Design a protein around this ligand. Sequence first.
Ligand SMILES: CC(=O)N[C@@H]1[C@@H](O)[C@H](O)[C@@H](CO)O[C@@H]1O
Length: 356
Amino acid sequence: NTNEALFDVASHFALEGTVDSIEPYGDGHINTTYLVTTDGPRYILQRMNTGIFPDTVNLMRNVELVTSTLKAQGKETLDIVRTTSGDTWAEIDGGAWRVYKFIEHTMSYNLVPNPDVFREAGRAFGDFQNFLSGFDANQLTETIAHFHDTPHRFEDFKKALAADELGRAAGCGPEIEFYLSHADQYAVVMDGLRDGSIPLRVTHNDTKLNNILMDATTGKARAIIDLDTIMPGSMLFDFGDSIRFGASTALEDERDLDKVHFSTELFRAYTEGFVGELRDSITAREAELLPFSGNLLTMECGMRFLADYLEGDVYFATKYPEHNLVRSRTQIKLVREMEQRADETRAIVADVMETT
Ligand SMILES: CC(=O)N[C@@H]1[C@@H](O)[C@H](O)[C@@H](CO)O[C@@H]1O
């Protein structure tokens, strides 16, 4: 979208000041996000990715339900700015757009800078599980099917591999072999959900560190800021995915793999914060799987990155041809380290469960 086009889009919303600029904000993989600067307040303007989220009406119904409930509890959350026609979003020139108020005086992190920040992230997402337990499974629509159904993701991967539409398979044999050889590990959470041994809960489903805003002065969690995948799942998806992104010593797309390690110190910090909020609620079987949920969600996301690479990068935004291969490689290195530290992560969870 050109500058003129974006100003036109913003004109559809009930903003409370004259727009001075609209500039790309962040490096999200999915939606297209802009910071709108006025002569007074600031706003986040987003074009929703309708290739990924085709059901905008149900997506926005979820977002409206979650934010209105948080507000009714006095909690800070994403504040939808309505269109001038009074709607929660608008279709404008072939795009689906929404506006949130910009949440001021915050810090957000694409990588853990210190254990305290990750411990606070643990508190925030653990607290968010208690919030989501207030909803029935049926109140929140699945916005994406099979979202953390790792065996289903693996079927998708094999289809991408078989098509090999760009002939990229030949250059990622070792990565393909990793996901093939780990196929026996993908079913554990889905099987437990299906047999009732793992409770079905409403979960956030994209608990990466940069989805919590911390207060710029105190560092206390202020608000969670991606509500697009709130829907039934397992607590293990939220824990495991937090560990995948945040217990890494490197960026998700770190090109130098010698920078990429799984840190048990960071794993412990997050576990302390998360289990601290949930200790009397977590089931024995959930606790048992906390360390492996890290391996599982990391393998699932890596497999998705590699599938996308093999499909010509149709899902995730990329900046260069091998971007998704580079992303997949970090996830592989992390899993390999998580495997080597399995006894230690088990002992960490036991100690936190005992301590809390
Ligand atoms: C809606 C969607 O696919 N979101 C994904 C999330 O699943 C994935 O873990 C992450 C990796 O950085 O990128 C996006 O946030």
